[PDB]
Design a binder for this molecule. Structure first.
Ligand code: HEC
Ligand code: HEC
Lengths: 108, 108
């Protein structure tokens, strides 16, 4: 929509340096600070099982699609006020396109 | 000196998206637009054999060291006026640290 495909390899590294500390993407992957992200796109916010989400996350009932994920990736707390994700944000569209491209591919 | 180690994987991708179009790093790698970069660090500018450099490059007789490479990576034409490298430049220190870290490792 207002999301353009980017570098999958570029995104894989962004993930390692900004997301891996708290999340996993593989199927059969374990939750850590952050919930496992396999099958995220199309799922609504706060539905992974065996993971303890904030009230904030649950109640947004965000349908993850490349578009929304881009909003959220800019500034998680402004997007979902109350959330415990301590990620400052990805101000760069290019950075986000790359990431979501990556996520798009490795979370399926 | 004024160069700090960064992400090798992060740098590998930067290379793919901004350098691979014209250069190779592997030993036994071929020149393309750009010369093969194996063994670059410690070599002086314009000495790869069988590659056609500008007068500009030769005459700088730049000793490649992480430091110099960082200068050059910011703005090649301002650094070596006359050069045919059509790279706008890496204005980001973080981007450059990552790249040189990468280069440092894969050109040896
Ligand atoms: C720890 C410092 C984190 C880092 C770095 C990143 N995330 Fe995160 N994430 C974290 C927590 C604690 C939570 C849950 C918040 C809550 O209120 O319960 C999250 C949540 C997400 C989600 C939503 C999950 C869902 O609804 O199933 C997404 C899509 C997500 N995180 C993605 C994500 C990406 C892509 C990151 C890297 C730039 C990233 N997070 C960083 C903790 C941490
Ligand atoms: C084609 C569009 C290029 C891209 C993209 C990059 N480089 Fe380049 N490089 C290119 C040329 C044509 C030349 C030679 C210029 C001349 O005057 O003859 C170069 C040269 C270099 C050098 C110096 C080589 C030496 O002295 O042996 C270096 C260190 C170098 N290039 C590195 C480099 C990196 C790290 C790049 C990605 C950010 C990059 N180049 C992009 C052509 C092209």
């Amino acid at each position: 929509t207002e999301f353009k495909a980017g570098s999958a390899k570029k995104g894989a590294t962004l993930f390692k340096t900004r997301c891996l500390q708290c999340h996993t993407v593989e199927k059969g992957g374990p939750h850590k600070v952050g919930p496992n992200l396999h099958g995220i796109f199309g799922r609504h916010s706060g539905q992974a099982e065996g993971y303890s989400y904030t009230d904030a996350n649950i109640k947004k009932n965000v349908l993850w699609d490349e578009n929304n994920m881009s909003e959220y990736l800019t500034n998680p707390k402004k997007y979902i006020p109350g959330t415990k994700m301590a990620f400052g944000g990805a101000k760069k569209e290019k950075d986000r396109n790359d990431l979501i491209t990556y996520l798009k591919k490795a979370t399926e």
